[model samples]
Target: CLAEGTRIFDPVTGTTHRIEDVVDGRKPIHVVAAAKDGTLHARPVVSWFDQGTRDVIGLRIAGGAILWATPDHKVLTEYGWRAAGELRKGDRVAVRDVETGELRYSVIREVLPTRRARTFDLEVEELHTLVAEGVVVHN
Candidate 1:
């Protein structure tokens, strides 16, 4: 699960929305998601999960995308889905190419343990993956 202030990239509106706001709206939403083949597309979010407060870590990507998520939360890497706890500096993570809508990989610059905060996740249809703050993450 991602922390309360995490910004999820909404492909439908060409904007980003805070996870807290999305959870508060309680409505169906669409986000930039990656297919199994590494292609990028807009996917419908079928459900939202409130994981409540828990320990989290802040991941800083090469492109300035910062993500705060639980240690066990999975993010897409070149090899496969890897937990935040296992990510190391220089590890590449999937990100979206905003201009071309292509899938791109960004290096993890830093991983720092952050404060406990309310966390949330979206159950994306089919692919079960979404871009949070420009980085690909699992539902």
Candidate 2:
């Protein structure tokens, strides 16, 4: 979701700059989002140079970008969006198979349950179900 005027910080170099300037490849930088709490978000950004090298879309924020969470084995469902523990085996849900890059229907196979507020370990069939470490998009 970064743009020309957006303020960004390059954690690798410990410098802050605008998205426009950062894309200039002042040496192959990795920029991350500045979270609401001011801590840098945990996501790697594709640069304009890299986009040209790989020939991926370079329109907005490296174009056609979908922010996906690192797989934590949680089945994100309509009702259980907030808490993965509320989901049970055999529950129908929507998930993306990162391997194939397709959105398809899937079902939970297992859950390592714990207290009310606890991280869950889930296993699902037909889709890759997982939780994310951080939100990558702004707005």
Candidate 3:
């Protein structure tokens, strides 16, 4: 299990993945979320009665599903919207110009670890932050 203060990152946006309460799917359509790396995961449990490895996150026909990646599941790039795994450092990409309200080209100087964002906090609503190596704190 993840420990406290663990932080999750967006595979595409390189932003923080905020933790929130689980959603419900009482009515209407629902969808589970994929991991930040743009990969859907599933692992098998030792259940015997007509069971197989189940999806950790992805499409589901249950209560309001969970999400890890952004809704669009893509990031801006020089060519166009690309999967998170497709982005690379130094790529000319389009980012929202906060001040001008326009799109602009910029080189991606660095790429943060996508796996680094998986946080370990599931207590009361709070954000996680890494204070140091193997050390986490809550806010």
Number of the top lDDT candidate: 1
Q: Please give the CA lDDT of all the candidate structures.
A: 0.81, 0.33, 0.28
Question: Model 2: per-residue lDDT, tens digit, 1-139?
Answer: 2223334444457566554464564435454433223333334443243122111111111112222111222333544443333444555555333455334445444433331211111111212222121122221
Candidate 2 to truth, TM: 0.28
The sequence of per-residue lDDT tens digits that candidate 3 reaches over residues 16-130 is 4322211111111111122223322222111112111222112111122112232223443445455544544554544333356333445554444333222222221122111
Show where candidate 1 strays beyond 4 Å.
none
Tens-digit lDDT track of model 1 for 1-139: 8798888778688777888999767668788777788877788878877888899989998867788889899888888888888877788888777777777766778878667889886787888777888778886
TM-score of 1: 0.91
For every model in order, what is the number of clashing pairs?
0, 0, 8
TM-score of 3: 0.33
Off by over 4 Å in 3: 1-72, 116-139
TM-score, every prediction = 0.91, 0.28, 0.33
Worst ten in a row by lDDT for model 1: 97-106
